Design a protein around this nucleic acid. Structure first.
Ligand SMILES: [Mg+2]
Ligand SMILES: [Zn+2]
Ligand SMILES: [Zn+2]
Lengths: 98, 72, 1316
DNA sequence: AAAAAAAAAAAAAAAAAAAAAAAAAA
DNA sequence: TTTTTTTTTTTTTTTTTTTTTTT
């Protein structure tokens, strides 16, 4: 079972799992440790920001790929902002700085 | 390329190798700055690594080329 | 984008600003039209449109009306994303106390107001009252009341005095607190008060209050007044497959909260009685509690931090069952065509668009769907050289993900290089591997330069190659090079390997026949110049054929052996070390090819006749039966006990099992008895099973043993080995009961495997969590301190030589060979195999070497402190994160784990470490020092042995002498605690009161009785204070003066002692005066958590003479008086332990008082950081060595460094720290360094070993801990402290989604930090 | 008929930590 | 008779998804 780009989850814009849904594999905690065990940094950022979470990022990467460019635009993980909003829902005041 | 250990022999850091290779490949991929070494129907990555092996690429040639480009 | 992130507590004004309206309706939609209800949970005019750039009423469906809000429905025509971003709020009629601060244990509001949590809970739950501004009344400010006392206060103080109950009361309390007076009075009390619990609570409160005033916060903010509400998008109303709605409980909780708040407002409008509104307020508080504790969304294995931030599903992925293929090269792996065409679909579309074969991307879509032959050429173009990551399921070590060049192949299985399988721990019984695709040029170069399988042929755990050929290649090679006495082509001469191959393949010559040939070997002994040497070599035909595959540099003798598994492994290691990397990769591919091919040519099958049952099995078994029957009848007659009979039977069964083992090995290994072209000759056997066991392909002597000979003796459920062992073996039949016993043996092993893996996962989890931050940052700290490195001997042969320990590290001080004043190497030069061998031949016994735990690096580790980066030759690079690789190396082998006298052997001189001896009466040399040790220095001069000699031993020889090999010298009596005497003289009865202190017990066997000293309790209290004292006196009766001091020789015995001698008998030096009566993975987990063992062996807290204190006041008190220092310290001891120190002993600080397991914390506070890390690394290394797995000490060392990252202050010094404060070590280090560089003075600190989880919680970066092992506590602390996040480590940056400052990204960080 | 918790199965094993109770004074 | 220390006891953490009861 494989995938290139299909429907994402609603609550968090992440690729679906499983086989019944046309999903993608899980880059789990252990895999992240194994990646950062190397000096591999850009690949991890691509895995967990542009290929899985960043709603605007992945669309732009797709468009660049179709245009022969392999350029990465950082943006920000969507689920990160989701977590920020959720914890702001509690009695917690968290914000971003300069 | 079987491996890039020779590139490390040329640039012992093993990390700036990746940065310079990616910079050269990005510059020569999107447009302009044609590769200076013959290719083998390979992607920009492989030819950039081969050029780093050949020694014509280093940590200074990219900077001086950018400076000359800036000067014009 | 943002260098750092900040956190603070919620304020009503900020809550109002965040929201964009009040959701007054506890409703979903109008349920009369399809227009969502006004100010409902899904409110358009509060949040935004449901459809992009279209109003709810449809007034403006056009972009030109962007920004302008309608009036018919009041919906601001924007993108639907505004619904995701815009929040909401609920104005609560009654204030609500936030619940996280209520049950945090310790509660924030709890100790902030300095009242018990029970009273706070009772007050908030509307079942009590509290005092607000008691004033001139009988009621204290913090006093709480009940309904009866409320009525009493009303009757007596219904005037100005006032009180409340619940949320409003607590809000009034918080609003009516100052902070200046609180801080001042609390500081005064801390300075004056000297009680541990009050002092601790007071300093905790001072820290909380000073942090709060430092932060821009007010206590009332911790009580909710306006409740924020999540954007509707994050709480979607998903309809199930039909006419129904099934969304999260969040919508239900919000509906409940809004309904209850509306009901409370309505009742307050109605002015209901206080009881009904009280119930309403309590219900509203419960509803807010249920809505808040979101926690689960943030908590749990399925929380945002762990399920959606760290471990994130990713596109461009796939998976499949794996399968073998020889034809692949190590730098590439196969790939099913379908997954190739599916993964690179964006890439193929782009390549087709650029190629011009199509214009609209839909044309390329229809092309790929049609499977047009053009698409395959595009696939070969994109796949040309474009690595992909092949990852297995349990990613334990960094090798769990390796890059590979795809090679499109038909089928549906991920073909894998065979060799690399060994690294993955991947067997082909159906395991499923995942394929990921790097996208960007950064990532492609990153995968090819680091994760390519070529770049990883040396493991990070240790220097052993990881590409060790596994099972089939090894058997083929071994069968290719193995001499038989005679065969076709035996006894000729070959001009070279080429015609050897020609002869074998033609069938004219056997694959192996001892024969002389001509081989040319190339050697680079000169300055990197190849020299050719050739001559006649006696070898084997298959061996000569193999020689064509070795590169030039290697010698020839390397392939003149049988080439077992270990031989091939070290042969590849030699190739890697002498010829670099590329030759080794080519050589590994070739060795796999030439192993599989000749294994195929061998036809090494296994039939049932390949395992012969030795004839002695029956006879050995029958003799064993006769012996066990004889011992059984001997027990029947009563000559022995049941235990003695059991032990005897087990021992003889073990001996018979060994006999059968030896018989079977003799039968197998030299089975071959064939002609030599003469009469007869024996040779190493060609029996199939023996070949597959000797080569090391599969199994070993242990495994073959139960295929032919008896299985031995299996364990009944609890290891209690049955006295009727399995007399049968697998080749023969097994009866029913023997199989039942084997099931007993095997089910426990399977269940072990399962739960052991479960636990090892969590051990690795903690290990990586506690060593996330450490990233190599500095080349060298320029520090001279280090740890001593020596070979390890437990009391026998050396378990692990000095070379293995020292290899790959950086020396701290110059090596001083025993040619004293000979500078063998510089004091700070790296060490590798050549220098290691030079030290070895120099016979260097101990070396000072640099360790990360000693490094003076700031927020990191000095590179030279880490030495050689395993998995690569040269030294560590600037950046490569050591913490995660070290944690993985320590944790991965967790799966492999499983949950008298001395006879000196070698010949050498005798050395005594910590020597304090005396000549006994017989003339032998006894030891009067508990901590003395014996070294056997070989003739060379090095330490080849070391033995712990207990107190009062026996020695035939003396110091500085020589003992032949095997000469028993060390011996002692471990039964009774000796009372040996230092001097010689008469023995009186001094303070031996008979009838009150002691008793007379008669030895019935002989009649020669002996005085008996009872304990302190059994006798009278009057005799309790009367000490039993044995004093030595001279012939004249005068006291004997011990040399070195004026004190006489008096000995004080403990309770339950048996005094041997009587009055009127002289005693020599060293006479016993009284007969004194007397683990697997969990061990590693306990060790790294650094927990107090069951019996915390207590060491000497301070140097000085020792004495006893108050007796049986719960425990016995020992007081050590320093000779020149201060005595007043005391030590309580459970006196029922068999202590080691007498009453008149002078010992050094940190000397064992009661033996047993040693607590790490006391070891530090008594020995030192180097000593405790030595103990930890040695013990865990012993645990791993128990199973044979090898882990380089550096990883344990760095983990230990992280475990002690925290420390405590002993004095504030000229700084502004609190003495009772407890802070990160490097913080005080840099502070005191900058203070000392100036004219001021520094402070003093004591280090402590916080357990791996404990030290992990000390991580200042709350984001790390907020994602690790808890959310409640970490978030509570971050909120109260208002701790800004620095984003320095590796885990937090992953959460933020920016480049990790570990590998390549480090350079980028090195740029960004340069900006500021 | 409408609104609201979990008292309504559950316990193991072990550990960390907080609160209460019991020595042992002067 | 009060107060500090230690011990003991209670409670809260550590690797597949909600009806019945009351007003
Ligand atoms: Mg398997
Ligand atoms: Zn409208
Ligand atoms: Zn250092």
């Amino acid at each position: 079972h494989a995938r290139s780009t299909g429907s994402y989850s609603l609550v968090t814009q992440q690729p679906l799992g499983g086989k019944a849904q046309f999903g993608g594999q899980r880059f789990g905690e252990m895999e992240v440790w194994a990646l950062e065990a190397y000096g591999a940094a850009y690949t991890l950022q691509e895995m967990l920001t542009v290929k899985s979470d960043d709603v605007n990022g992945r669309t732009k990467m797709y468009k660049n790929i179709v245009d022969g460019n392999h350029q990465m635009e950082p943006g920000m993980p969507e689920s990160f902002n989701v977590l920020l909003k959720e914890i702001r829902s509690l009695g917690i005041n968290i914000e971003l700085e300069d | 390329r079987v491996t890039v250990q020779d590139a490390v022999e040329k640039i012992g850091n093993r990390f700036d190798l990746v940065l310079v290779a990616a910079r050269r490949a990005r510059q020569m991929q999107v447009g302009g700055k044609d590769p200076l070494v013959p290719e083998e129907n390979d992607k920009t990555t492989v030819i950039a690594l081969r050029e780093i092996e050949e020694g014509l690429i280093n940590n200074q040639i990219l900077d001086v080329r950018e400076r000359q480009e800036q000067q014009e | 984008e943002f260098d750092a992130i900040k956190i603070a507590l919620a304020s009503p004004d900020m809550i109002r600003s965040w929201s964009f309206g009040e959701v007054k309706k506890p409703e979903t939609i109008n349920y009369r039209t399809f227009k969502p209800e006004r100010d409902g949970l899904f409110c358009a005019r509060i949040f935004g449109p449901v459809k992009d750039y279209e109003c709810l009423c449809g007034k403006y469906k056009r972009l030109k009306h962007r920004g302008v809000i309608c009036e018919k429905c009041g919906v601001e025509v924007t993108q639907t994303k505004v619904r995701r971003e815009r929040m909401g709020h609920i104005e609560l009629a009654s204030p609500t106390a936030h619940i996280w601060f209520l049950k945090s244990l310790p509660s924030r509001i709890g100790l902030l107001l300095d009242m018990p949590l029970r009273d706070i809970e009772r007050v908030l739950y509307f079942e009590s009252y509290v005092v607000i501004e008691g004033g001139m009344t009988n009621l204290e400010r913090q006093q709480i009341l009940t309904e009866e006392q409320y009525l009493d206060a009303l009757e007596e103080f219904g005037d100005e005095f006032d009180a409340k109950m619940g949320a409003e009361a607590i809000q009034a309390l918080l609003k009516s607190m100052d902070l200046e007076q609180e801080c001042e009075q609390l500081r005064e009390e801390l300075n004056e008060t000297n009680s541990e619990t009050k002092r601790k609570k007071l300093t905790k409160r001072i820290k909380l209050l000073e942090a709060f005033v430092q932060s821009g916060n007010k206590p009332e903010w911790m009580i909710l007044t306006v409740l924020p509400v999540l954007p509707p998008d994050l709480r979607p109303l998903v309809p199930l497959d039909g006419g129904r709605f099934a969304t999260s409980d969040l919508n239900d909780l919000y509906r409940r909260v809004i309904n209850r708040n509306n009901r409370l407002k309505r009742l307050l409008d109605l002015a209901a009685p206080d009881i009904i509104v009280r119930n309403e307020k309590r219900m509203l508080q419960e509803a807010v509690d249920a809505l808040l504790d979101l926690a689960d969304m943030i908590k749990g294995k399925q929380g945002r931090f762990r399920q959606n931030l760290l471990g994130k599903r990713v596109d461009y992925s796939g998976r499949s069952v794996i399968t073998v293929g020889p034809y692949l090269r190590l730098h590439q792996c196969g790939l099913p065509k379908k997954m190739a065409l599916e993964l690179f679909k964006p890439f193929i579309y782009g390549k087709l668009e650029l190629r011009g074969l199509a214009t609209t991307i839909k044309a390329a879509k229809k092309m790929v769907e049609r499977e047009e032959a053009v698409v395959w050429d595009i696939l070969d173009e994109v796949i040309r050289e474009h690595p992909v990551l092949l990852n297995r399921a349990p990613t334990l070590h960094r090798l769990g993900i390796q890059a590979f060049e795809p090679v499109l192949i038909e089928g549906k299985a991920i073909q894998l290089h065979p060799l690399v399988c060994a690294a993955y721990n991947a067997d082909f019984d159906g395991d499923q591997m995942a394929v990921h695709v790097p996208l960007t040029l950064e990532a492609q170069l990153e995968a090819r330069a680091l994760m390519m399988s070529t770049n990883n042929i040396l493991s990070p755990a240790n220097g052993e190659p990881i590409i060790v050929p596994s099972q089939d290649v090894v058997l083929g090679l071994y069968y290719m090079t193995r001499d038989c006495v005679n065969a076709k082509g035996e006894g000729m001469v070959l001009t070279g390997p080429k015609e050897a191959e020609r002869l074998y393949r033609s069938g004219l010559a056997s694959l192996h026949a001892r024969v002389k040939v001509r081989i040319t070997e190339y050697e680079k002994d000169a300055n990197g110049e190849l020299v050719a040497k050739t001559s006649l070599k006696d070898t084997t035909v298959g061996r000569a054929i193999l020689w064509m595959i070795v590169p030039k540099g290697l010698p020839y003798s390397i392939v003149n052996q049988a080439l077992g598994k270990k031989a091939i492994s070290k042969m590849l290691n030699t190739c890697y070390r002498i010829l670099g990397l590329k030759p080794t990769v080519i050589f590994a591919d070739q060795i796999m090819y030439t192993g599989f091919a000749y294994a195929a040519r061998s036809g090494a099958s296994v039939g049932i006749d390949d395992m012969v049952i030795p004839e002695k099995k029956h006879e050995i078994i029958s003799e064993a039966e006769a012996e066990v029957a004889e011992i059984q009848e001997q027990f029947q007659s009563g000559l022995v006990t049941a235990g003695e009979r059991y032990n005897k039977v087990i021992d003889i069964w073990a001996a018979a099992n060994d006999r059968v083992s030896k018989a079977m090995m003799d039968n197998l290994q030299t089975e071959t008895v064939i002609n030599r072209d003469g009469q007869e000759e024996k040779q190493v056997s060609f029996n199939s099973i023996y070949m597959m066991a000797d080569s090391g392909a599969r199994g070993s002597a242990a495994q073959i043993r139960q295929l032919a000979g008896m299985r031995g003796l299996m364990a009944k459920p609890d290891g209690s080995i049955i006295e009727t062992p399995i007399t049968a073996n697998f080749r023969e039949g097994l009866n029913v009961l023997q199989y039942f016993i084997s099931t007993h043996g095997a089910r426990k092993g399977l269940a072990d495997t399962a739960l052991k893996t479960a636990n090892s996962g969590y051990l690795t989890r903690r290990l990586v969590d506690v060593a996330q931050d450490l990233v190599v940052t500095e080349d060298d700290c320029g520090t001279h301190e280090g740890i001593m490195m020596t070979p390890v001997i437990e009391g026998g042969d050396v378990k692990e030589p000095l070379r293995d320990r020292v290899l790959g590290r950086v020396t701290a001080e110059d090596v001083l060979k025993p040619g004293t004043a000979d500078i063998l190497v510089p004091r700070n030069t790296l060490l590798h195999e050549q220098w290691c061998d030079l030290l070895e031949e120099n016979s260097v016994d101990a070396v000072k070497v640099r360790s990360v735990v000693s490094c003076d690096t700031d927020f990191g580790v000095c590179a030279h402190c880490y030495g050689r980066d395993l998995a690569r030759g040269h030294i560590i690079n600037k950046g490569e994160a050591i913490g995660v690789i070290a944690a993985q190396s320590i944790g991965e082998p967790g799966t492999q784990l499983t949950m008298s006298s001395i006879q000196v052997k070698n010949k050498g001189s005798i050395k005594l470490s910590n020597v304090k001896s005396v000549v006994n009466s017989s003339g032998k040399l006894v030891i009067t020092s508990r901590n003395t040790e014996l070294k056997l220095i070989d003739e060379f001069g090095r330490t080849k042995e070391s033995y712990k000699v207990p107190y009062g031993a026996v020695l035939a020889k003396g110091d500085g002498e020589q003992v032949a090999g095997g000469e028993t010298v060390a011996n002692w009596d471990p039964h009774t605690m000796p009372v040996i005497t230092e001097v010689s003289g008469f023995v009186r009865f001094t303070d031996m009161i008979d009838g009150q202190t002691i008793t007379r017990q008669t030895d019935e066997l002989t009649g020669l009785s002996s005085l008996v000293v009872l304990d302190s309790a059994e006798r009278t209290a009057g005799g309790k204070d009367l000490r039993p004292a044995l004093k030595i006196v001279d012939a004249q009766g005068n006291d004997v003066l011990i040399p070195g001091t004026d004190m006489p020789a008096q000995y004080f015995l403990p309770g339950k002692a048996i005094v041997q001698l009587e009055d009127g008998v002289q005693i020599s030096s060293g006479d016993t005066l009284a007969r004194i009566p007397q683990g697997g993975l969990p061990r590693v987990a306990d060790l790294f958590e650094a927990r107090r063992p069951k019996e915390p062996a207590i060491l000497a807290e301070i140097s000085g003479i020792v004495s006893f204190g108050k007796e049986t006041k719960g425990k016995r008190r020992l007081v050590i008086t320093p000779v020149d220092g201060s005595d007043p310290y005391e030590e309580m001891i459970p006196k029922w332990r068999q202590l080691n120190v007498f009453e008149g002993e002078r010992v050094e600080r940190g000397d064992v008082i009661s033996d047993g397991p040693e607590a790490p914390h006391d070891i530090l506070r008594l020995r030192g950081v180097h000593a405790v890390t030595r103990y930890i690394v040695n013990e865990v290394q012993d645990v791993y060595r128990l199973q044979g797995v090898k882990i380089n000490d550096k990883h344990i060392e760095v983990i230990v460094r992280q475990m002690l990252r925290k420390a405590t202050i002993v004095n504030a010094g000229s700084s502004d720290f609190l003495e009772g404060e407890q802070v990160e070590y490097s913080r005080v280090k840099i502070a005191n360094r900058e203070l000392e560089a100036n004219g001021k003075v520094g402070a003093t600190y004591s280090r402590d070993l916080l357990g791996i989880t404990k030290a992990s919680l000390a991580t200042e970066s709350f984001i790390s801990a907020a994602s690790f092992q808890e959310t409640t506590r970490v978030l509570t602390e971050a909120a109260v402290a208002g701790k800004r996040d620095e984003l320095r480590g590796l885990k937090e940056n992953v959460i933020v989604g920016r480049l990790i400052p570990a590998g390549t990204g480090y350079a980028y960080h090195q740029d960004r930090m340069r900006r500021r």
